[PDB]
């Protein structure tokens, strides 16, 4: 029925915009169309490294695409094979000067949108879903944190009765503002249904 997106509830504090610039009221329209089909193309051809963020900064014609990953290798190649073809590909729709980067996540178990995709892959390859969850939570809190939570939707085991599986440890005050709690969500896609996974990480405070 209810429970709102924990990102939208922070924006003003804590979480910052995953696309920050300014633009006019003939141009937001257009600069926005761009920003999706960008993040759309990247989502595909780059899944392999686990793009847990896709920032975009800007001033005028100068794009600051920064991709954040825990396994940086896959994006470059050794020296520069892959990174080459992408620069080409990006500006292949945008006749503007495409300035692409990469950044590192010290611990991927503390990046939710990852934790979510990990468990969604585990389900697509038929593993015990009660376990996979109770386990992925230890993974996170094990590697230092204050709290963490996961939620898998309906058609567990491919049963005609769709349920909803839970489990989570520590503290997760989604109602509190001075919080900082990373959220991500993944789609498992099977022969019988379409599951849904939600991941929550409690990190700092004050």
């Amino acid at each position: 029925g209810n429970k709102i997106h924990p990102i939208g509830f922070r924006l003003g504090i804590t979480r910052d915009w995953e696309s920050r610039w300014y633009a006019g009221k003939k141009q937001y329209r257009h600069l926005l169309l761009e920003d999706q089909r960008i993040r759309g193309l990247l989502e595909k051809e780059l899944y392999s490294a686990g793009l847990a963020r896709v920032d975009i900064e800007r001033a005028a014609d100068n794009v600051a695409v920064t991709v954040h990953v825990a396994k940086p290798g896959v994006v470059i190649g050794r020296g520069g094979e892959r990174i080459r073809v992408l620069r080409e590909e990006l500006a292949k729709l945008t006749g503007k000067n495409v300035a692409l980067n990469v950044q590192e996540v010290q611990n991927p178990n503390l990046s939710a949108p990852l934790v979510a995709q990990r468990v969604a892959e585990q389900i697509e390859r038929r593993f015990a879903v009660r376990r996979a969850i109770k386990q992925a939570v230890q993974r996170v809190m094990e590697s230092g944190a204050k709290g963490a939570k996961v939620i898998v939707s309906g058609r567990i085991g491919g049963a005609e009765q769709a349920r909803t599986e839970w489990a989570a440890q520590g503290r997760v005050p989604l109602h509190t503002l001075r919080a900082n709690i990373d959220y991500g969500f993944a789609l498992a896609r099977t022969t019988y249904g379409v599951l849904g996974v939600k991941a929550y990480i409690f990190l700092g405070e004050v």
Binding site: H5, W17, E18, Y22, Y28, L32
Partner: protein, 60 residues
């Protein structure tokens, strides 16, 4: 008539009166904003993720 239509929206046949709006993500026909090019849902989904610069949770 869902696919055939979103494609009819792009072209501008006879008499410019016919040229209707249409959401970008959602093939949405109703509830479509000039400023964003988007539907009411399409929008609200985004706004929560930050993919729309400076569009913040209101409160007055």
């Amino acid at each position: 008539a869902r696919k055939a239509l979103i494609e009819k929206a792009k072209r501008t046949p006879k008499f410019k009166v016919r040229a209707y709006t249409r959401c970008v993500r959602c093939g949405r026909a109703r509830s479509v904003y000039r400023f964003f090019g988007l539907c009411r849902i399409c929008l609200r989904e985004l706004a929560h993720k930050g993919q729309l610069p400076g569009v913040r949770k209101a409160s007055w």
